[PDB]
């Protein structure tokens, strides 16, 4: 049994809810929240800007030190950093950004990072400002992630379309 409430069950291991990820993390304090990161860990908009704003910019300060030491992530890759006031840990995962021309086949590689964690609160990778089709992102999630994932979908309209169209 875990703390997540109000989710619709899609599969054995994937759950979904219409919720602002910033507010869900604050309520649950999950072991892992996933950030929709870029390779530079520059958290300016979308899930990253909102998560980072909720940490009062402490996520960005920590991230800048990580990049200064290690250099940029790979598209499809990840790193584990602090969850600050939102979670124990933040798993920063880089999905491909269609608005930069990145290979959508890298979305499966991105979701494979989730399998290193037993339970996660996450957004749909490569959705929203990353430019991918969220229906596709949910299909790749279900077909790739084997650990227990609780997906927070920001837009109510999109949430209802993802549920209604789910195979
Ligand atoms: O899921 C998203 O796309 C999401 C969530 C919260 C935000 O503030 C945002 F800009 C985007």
Swiss-Prot record:
**Localisation per UniProt entry:** Host endoplasmic reticulum membrane
- Membrane topology annotation: Multi-pass membrane protein
How activity is controlled: the entry says: Inhibited in vitro by GRL-0617.
Which intervals hold domain Macro?
A: 1-167
What, per the annotation, is the impact of changing residue 31 to A?
In strain: Mu/B.1.621
Taxonomically, the superkingdom here is Viruses
- Catalytic function, reaction form: Thiol-dependent hydrolysis of ester, thioester, amide, peptide and isopeptide bonds formed by the C-terminal Gly of ubiquitin (a 76-residue protein attached to proteins as an intracellular targeting signal)
- Subunit and interaction comment: May form homohexamers. Interacts with N protein.
Functional summary from the UniProt entry: Responsible for the cleavages located at the N-terminus of the replicase polyprotein. Participates together with nsp4 in the assembly of virally-induced cytoplasmic double-membrane vesicles necessary for viral replication. Antagonizes innate immune induction of type I interferon by blocking the phosphorylation, dimerization and subsequent nuclear translocation of host IRF3. Also prevents host NF-kappa-B signaling. In addition, PL-PRO possesses a deubiquitinating/deISGylating activity and processes both 'Lys-48'- and 'Lys-63'-linked polyubiquitin chains from cellular substrates.
What name goes with this protein? Papain-like protease nsp3
Give the organism, scientific name: Severe acute respiratory syndrome coronavirus 2 (2019-nCoV)
* Interval of the full protein contained in this chain: 1025 to 1191 of 7096
């Amino acid at each position: 049994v875990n703390s997540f409430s109000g989710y619709l069950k899609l599969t054995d291991n994937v759950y979904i809810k219409n919720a602002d990820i910033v507010e869900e993390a604050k309520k649950v304090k999950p072991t892992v929240v996933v950030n929709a990161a870029n390779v530079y860990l520059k958290h300016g908009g979308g899930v990253a800007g909102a998560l980072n704003k909720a940490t009062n910019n402490a996520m960005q300060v920590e991230s800048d030190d990580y990049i200064a030491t290690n250099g940029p992530l790979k598209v499809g890759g990840s790193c584990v950093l602090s969850g600050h006031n939102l979670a124990k840990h933040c798993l920063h995962v880089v999905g491909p950004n269609v608005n930069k021309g990145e290979d959508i086949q890298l979305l499966k590689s991105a979701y494979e990072n989730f399998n290193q964690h037993e339970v996660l609160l996450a957004p749909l990778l490569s959705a929203g400002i990353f430019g991918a089709d969220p229906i596709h992102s949910l299909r790749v999630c279900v077909d790739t992630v084997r650990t227990n994932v609780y997906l927070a979908v920001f837009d109510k309209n999109l949430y209802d379309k993802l549920v209604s169209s789910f195979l």
